[model samples]
Target: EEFVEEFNRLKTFANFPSGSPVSASTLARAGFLYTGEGDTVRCFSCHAAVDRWQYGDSAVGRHRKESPNCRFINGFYL
Candidate 1:
């Protein structure tokens, strides 16, 4: 998936715990690119801006939970 590819590229620049399901890198991988503003990330597919500094947060999981129909999260991307 192009989104995954883009995310991999961005992940190189992110810092997240190893082997964690949810992290900054995961969020980036899920199409939530950093907006360079106080832990804010914007999803390319869903256009949703989410905060990244929540306690015990999972970026990918939260996105999927919040937006079950997101194309990128639901594997319906073009």
Candidate 2:
């Protein structure tokens, strides 16, 4: 799948946790890649940064709220 392929490519540059509450795969699917810091995830489409992610946190939902204009979040990439 194109999504998986792109996610794998991005994973090469991301530094996500080995075992985290928020699944790295979930974030990747949401067009986010780890920033190699404390729960910091950045959106590939908008370059918007979200940090301090915790259990039950929804990366996609947060991205939609914080960056409503983001192409990925707004379903432009759909």
Candidate 3:
């Protein structure tokens, strides 16, 4: 999937909790804002396909471990 490339780009940004599903909010709290130029943020803005052969290397996949604890306040809008 094309998301694989995106995942690789954001692998380092992902912060999945040891043994759980990565959540969207985790990315935001980790200082990973959306690069999308629109009102709606893209899914890739806060998710990376971990534990898989995504992008070039599997070093950083999805953080299906961290809790999906993202805060959607007014500041979230870019």
TM per candidate comes to 0.64, 0.76, 0.20
Q: What lDDT tens digits, residue by residue, belong to model 1 across residues 1-78?
A: 244577553754354344543566556666687666656677777777776356677677778876788888887654
Output the better candidate (1/3) by TM-score: 1
TM-score of 3: 0.20
TM-score of 2: 0.76
Provide the global lDDT of candidate 1 against the true structure. Answer: 0.65
Runs in model 2 deviating more than 4 A are 1-5, 13-15
Candidate 1's TM-score reads 0.64
Residues 1-78, candidate 2: write the lDDT tens digits. 233355562664455667677777777777887677877877777878888777888868888988988877777766
Where is the poorest 10-residue window by lDDT in model 3? 52-61
Choose the strongest candidate by TM-score. Answer: 2
Best candidate, lDDT: 2
Query: Which window of 10 residues has the lowest lDDT sum in candidate 1?
Result: 12-21
lDDT of 3 by residue, 3-60 (tens): 3243443554344344424333444333333433321123333442223222232121
Query: What pairs collide in candidate 1?
Result: none
